[PDB]
Amino acid sequence: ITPQNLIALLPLLIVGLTVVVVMLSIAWRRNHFLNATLSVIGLNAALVSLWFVGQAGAMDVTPLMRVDGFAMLYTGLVLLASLATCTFAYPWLEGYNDNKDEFYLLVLIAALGGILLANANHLASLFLGIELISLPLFGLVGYAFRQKRSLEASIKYTILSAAASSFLLFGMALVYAQSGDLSFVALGKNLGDGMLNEPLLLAGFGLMIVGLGFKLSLVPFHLWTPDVYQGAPAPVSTFLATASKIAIFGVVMRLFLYAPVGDSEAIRVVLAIIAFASIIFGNLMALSQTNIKRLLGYSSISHLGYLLVALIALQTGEMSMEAVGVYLAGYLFSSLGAFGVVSLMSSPYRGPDADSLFSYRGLFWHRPILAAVMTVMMLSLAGIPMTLGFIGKFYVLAVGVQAHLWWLVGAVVVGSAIGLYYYLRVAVSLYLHAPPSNWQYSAGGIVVLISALLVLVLGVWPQPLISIVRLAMPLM
Amino acid sequence: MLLPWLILIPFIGGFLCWQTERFGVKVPRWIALITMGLTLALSLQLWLQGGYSLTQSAGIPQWQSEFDMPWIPRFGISIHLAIDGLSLLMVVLTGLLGVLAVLCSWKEIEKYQGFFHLNLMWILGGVIGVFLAIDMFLFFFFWEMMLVPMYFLIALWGHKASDGKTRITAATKFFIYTQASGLVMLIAILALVFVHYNATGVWTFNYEELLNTPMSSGVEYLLMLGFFIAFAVKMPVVPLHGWLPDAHSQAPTAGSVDLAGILLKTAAYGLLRFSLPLFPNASAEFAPIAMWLGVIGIFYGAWMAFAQTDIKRLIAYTSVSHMGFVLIAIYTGSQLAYQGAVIQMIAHGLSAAGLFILCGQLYERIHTRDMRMMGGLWSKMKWLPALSLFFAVATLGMPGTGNFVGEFMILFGSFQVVPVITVISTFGLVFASVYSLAMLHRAYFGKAKSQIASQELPGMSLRELFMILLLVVLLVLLGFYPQPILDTSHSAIGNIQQWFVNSV
Amino acid sequence: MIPLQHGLILAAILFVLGLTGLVIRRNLLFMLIGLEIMINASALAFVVAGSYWGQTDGQVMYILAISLAAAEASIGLALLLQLHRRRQNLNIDSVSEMRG
Amino acid sequence: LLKRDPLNSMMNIPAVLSRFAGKGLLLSENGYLRWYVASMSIGAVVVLALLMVL
């Protein structure tokens, strides 16, 4: 333990100290404004302190943790997702008659688990980060537990995530039984000379794949996604869809990078089948959806399928990590803007009894700039050029072409066409004909407008994002 | 140097058309006319200063102008524009059709007319960018960014008599067709770039460096097939055509959208500029399939045109038949047939523009497109039936119009190359005469078949009349004097032909 | 003297028993009970793996696993109390309004 | 015989197939938590068997 290792820990320490400070401030008085401001101050401070961690370099802070620019990029994505979640949550929580302050404590603790997953280099840290993003999401998905749909989503996500955690833990135990070391780099070290595909290592990785693919909404562990997305509070849906997926795919990226069993052909084939099915099924199930939450859940299934396609080309290609980074930036901004428009139209919280239907038809004729942002993100998630979602799609196609993954490339094209149908249906329904007022709602509108402007600007001009993603390099 | 401004002037003009929407409702049409006239006059200036008639074929690449600025240096992607004779003819055609499109939507005084003008100039700038780009990623970028404005105005500004669901369906069909085919073209582009990088070791999307790419026979076939699938959706080639009549029928009522987006033939340019020089051997093996698809397109489009009761669908299927002729021409490898294809592209643009403008006017006066509800309209209108007679006469390929020069020069070169296909295509010209006379008899001749056809109709406005007469004069001048057009595009056509036949 | 395979197989038997109890039961309480069974089986497998290698890491992962089990049992029983308060029955098939 | 544009219908066939496949796939989203757990265990079985047969 060195004090430079303490310099590498600043996002973790700052988020934990924000957790303690917000908790004690709640214990003093219940003030929604003050506690929300303390939460966003702590998240902004950790986002700023990422610069000091970058000046600190890159080192292995523990047998558990390892921090490099890869980890700082994922930490920044998770912190931006959390800040947007709090910003959307305040006009939502203005209408919540029960305690509005526990929301921010759970959001901060989930951001702490996301940071741990961003920096995790160990099976113990991976398990801990998974559970640290899961349990606050149990609280947040059913924060409005008196609402029937929110209680349904809470029960579904809690039961299914406990089951997936059991699967992941059992797989980790079998992997440790084979390997004798919970470090990522030793998962396949004791094998060799073509004996990489040990059956117990493969089965342990299969159970971990079940747990993590539940966590990534990958087919066939995907059926929870539209129900949980629809039932959850809209800022909670934003946080789930952005932060949970990004953090877990970052740690899966790192696990398949440093594990020697990541070069197994069997795991590659299984992940290829999962990516193919995820793309096709998520695009096909969203064709006839009139609910924007379920539609965005199926969309998240398809986009994680594209991300998995970028994951398969890890060992054969070289631009796979950069492809995942650029795709994750575009996906983060796109899903942030989309679920943010849903959030501000679902704000304030009207109660457990009233319906929370979005009703996007005719949004332009009473709320035009949010309609423009919503259709910009619809074009971005469709992968249309002039959007950063296309830049991510282009990177995924480049790594699929370079690694000769022709089935996945054809799946990307076909699922893209089906996505064009349903995304354009939503985007043109925004301009059809249908039958707030404080500064926090304006701040949420500012957040979605900024994310839309960023996705448009990096659609037309993607070079700064490419350069800053390439700046991130891991400890290979 | 002046090509970046060639793409940028329509974009800034549409942006200012949207921005100065606050100053009035009839304000943005003048701004639209100003920016389209500026693009047209700049293209005419670069034509007059080009000196293409005194240019000799010196191989590929050979541009009158070129420009490179690094945009995504990570992949070696740059904004790389260039221009030579064929692309200059295409951009002059684009400017003229854009001016006609602006003049066509003159009386559309709506609240959101400025956004319609912004969409129209985004479309026109995208077409010009496809015609000027020689970076493959950048060319594909323009190829796909023409889509979004066209989709939005078909879905929202389209044919008001039909329900919104029909317009949305036509727009979604068009978007899905062209965007899926564009993604297939992107796959081919990425595979070509990666093959060159594996062969040499440098990242490039430059067209001039990707030409010397050593590929095995079969990989080149697949790259050619991806390019051809994109260029065949947009051509149109049967059976990838149905988006074209559904998009024409659900296009906005004025007819400007038909001129701005569809009636410019970027797919034939893509086949000449990219499919033949990058994959000459694969195009040589693919030539009989493309020629028989062209023959099928000619006769199927003729039979479809005869079967319509809607005039707009008839004109769309006429376009399908004419582009079947062009598709036969492009794969002959013949200089005479290539020049005939260039003339046919220009003449088809002018003649179909005149037909669509006249059909939009006729729908404005009679409020129906059904040919069973009209008849005897020669005695009811002052100018429209005779100009429609001229454009249907040009449509069947009558000498004295540019369509005859294009079709018969195509058939001369093709008969020098492929005689049987030429014979079948000339009987397709007989079919063209049949459907043109059928449309003339069903619309303007006989007795009135309804109540609206029995009434005297108002005469056309002077702006529409003058732009129709300008199209008439240009078509007649093309038919009687096509030599400046041939001398403009002789060098580029010659270089493409020499690269195609000196590689097989 | 004790095989590692026998401990791993015992953990697998308890895990699949917990999964069966999770699936077949309509009452939410027995679903939570099956979840506790599965997570205890996973913790047991980690203890067996750590004891085979002579490492503390198996017992440490056991501690982390039972911390998770305590947290999940707390949250699940809170949700079950909420369900019994709102709907007066623990039938999980009645909590099925969102579909499509 | 050709007035209904048969080639357009034969190219419209994949849209019909996509609509039918999406309608069929949406039946598995019945909203039952027990079926969601069952589908997770079925997918675990499929993944484990696929990893074992390679």
Ligand SMILES: CCCCCCCCCCCCCCCCCC(=O)OC[C@H](COP(=O)(O)OCCN)OC(=O)CCCCCCCCCCCCCCCCC
């Ligand atoms: C449904 C819509 C989407 C379309 C379907 C999805 C795409 C399908 C693409 C199928 C490609 C099949 C390739 C078969 C061989 C692969 C393995 C192999 O042996 O590759 C050979 C070669 C690598 O060896 P190398 O030494 O690099 O050779 C240099 C010469 N090129 O490999 C190479 O050099 C690279 C080969 C690349 C081949 C071109 C790939 C793209 C072609 C355009 C799209 C597909 C065709 C058009 C659409 C079909 C109908 C939808």
Ligand SMILES: CCCCCCCCCCCCCCCCCC(=O)OC[C@H](COP(=O)(O)OCCN)OC(=O)CCCCCCCCCCCCCCCCC
């Ligand atoms: C010639 C062969 C060789 C070259 C092949 C080139 C392939 C790419 C270019 C051609 C693409 C053809 C696409 C055909 C369908 C186009 C979409 C369409 O027609 O949508 C309309 C329809 C909605 O309209 P409606 O019938 O009113 O339905 C009411 C809805 N409740 O929409 C629907 O009902 C749902 C639409 C779902 C999304 C569209 C379907 C996508 C299917 C995959 C496309 C990729 C290509 C796969 C291979 C195609 C066949 C070769």
Ligand SMILES: CCCCCCCCCCCCCCCCCC(=O)OC[C@H](COP(=O)(O)OCCN)OC(=O)CCCCCCCCCCCCCCCCC
């Ligand atoms: C829900 C709807 C969607 C799902 C259902 C519909 C299906 C979707 C998928 C359709 C596309 C399937 C894949 C097509 C590409 C197959 C590639 C292949 O098999 O390549 C083999 C070979 C590769 O080249 P090779 O010879 O190995 O090179 C090294 C030494 N020369 O290749 C060769 O040697 C060249 C082979 C050329 C012929 C094969 C490609 C046919 C393409 C058909 C469509 C286009 C037809 C032409 C245009 C029609 C009019 C537009």
Ligand SMILES: CCCCCCCCCCCCCCCCCCCC
């Ligand atoms: C291609 C990248 C994105 C381009 C912009 C997409 C649209 C954004 C919103 C702009 C303003 C839209 C105004 C629509 C007015 C519709 C009026 C219809 C009248 C019938």
